[PDB]
Amino acid sequence: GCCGSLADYLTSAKFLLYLGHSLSTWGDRMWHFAVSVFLVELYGNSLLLTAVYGLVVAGSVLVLGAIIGDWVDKNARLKVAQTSLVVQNVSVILCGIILMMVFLHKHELLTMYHGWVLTSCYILIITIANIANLASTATAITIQRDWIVVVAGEDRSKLANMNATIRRIDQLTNILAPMAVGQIMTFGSPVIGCGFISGWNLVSMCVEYVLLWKVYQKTPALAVKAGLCASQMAEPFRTFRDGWVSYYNQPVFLAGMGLAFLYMTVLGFDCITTGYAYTQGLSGSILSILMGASAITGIMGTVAFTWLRRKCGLVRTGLISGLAQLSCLILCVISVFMPGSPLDLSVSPFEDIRSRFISVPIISVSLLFAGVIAARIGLWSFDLTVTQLLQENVIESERGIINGVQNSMNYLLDLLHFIMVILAPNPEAFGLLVLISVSFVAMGHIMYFRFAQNTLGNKLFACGPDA
């Protein structure tokens, strides 16, 4: 009951896939937090480096994501996975080494020449971080989509359970890793942090390599695969155009459309929301409690998605999730026109034309945070159902290109969001931004609604079977 069953469970493809994904996410999040903190620190606190980093990441993701989706769709599986892993890990190690070495020779190198090498070093850091992010995106899409779909086989409940477990692991890692890495940073020296990051990434490289080989050996169905200067610049353009037009012509175009539209928002736990809360003076312990509540509601959303998909269906699950999120956003919107809200149209939203950076009632904030948390539960359910739809309804010979164009679209809608944060950074004009975000959410769900009407007709409200 314990000696044999546990040993059998710990030697299955599912568990090894879970372990590999958890290690990869842990390493990625730790690296991301370390890079953010270090770039905030060694360079003076300013929006220039942050804006450059965000813009570079977004644009690279769009273009090279279409390209790498095409590349993944035309090679073997073990080769692509191993390649992605090695590239990402080596990028991270080298980047961290260079970072620490500059942290060392900072003043001497600044005095050297006319300071023209600091810019080169920043360029190198940005480029290598971008390369690592691209490799991480590639490995994420290939592993999750292709390998999860193949391993799950023919059962549909297994696919749902696998997706839910992946989401839970992602949420727990996202909550936990930054806290631990910040603790180890503040309890020591930057040498401790950088050495820890590099060593952890190296060991993770080795272990994940072995785990991927073992999973490939265990499942024999992964080996088979159905379907198997002017020109050097023209070929990428042809692949880009073909991928985008193929994505546009898919019958599930509107679902991915709505999911992408759901990405531009300020109603999420993020640097902007935390800054607004600090402006309102909500301390740090309360912020930690709110993050814990957010994680709990995300887990609850995954559980609800599993139950609903088992009970009602796939499309109706998306409808229910959309309705829930919309109601919670309405609750959040109510907060703006309430006492204690610093909003007025008299002050122009645009104040930094060319400069930039280069008591009170408490009901409003409480209502806002309740709204965002319940929105989080609904959004997680909707994300899971759309992901399963995309996994289930795409030809194998094109699972890479379609998912890559999806990622590009998602990042685009992210980029626009960042832009508006630059345009209206005033704490007063925050409320208006909220409205815009809610509006966008509505549009997405409306668009998803049309998809439902194209696949269910007038029988839009019947969860059970006919009687």
Partner: peptide, 10 residues
């Protein structure tokens, strides 16, 4: 959702 940033940092 936001792939890329936190900022101002038990």
């Amino acid at each position: 959702x936001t792939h890329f940033x936190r900022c101002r940092x038990x």
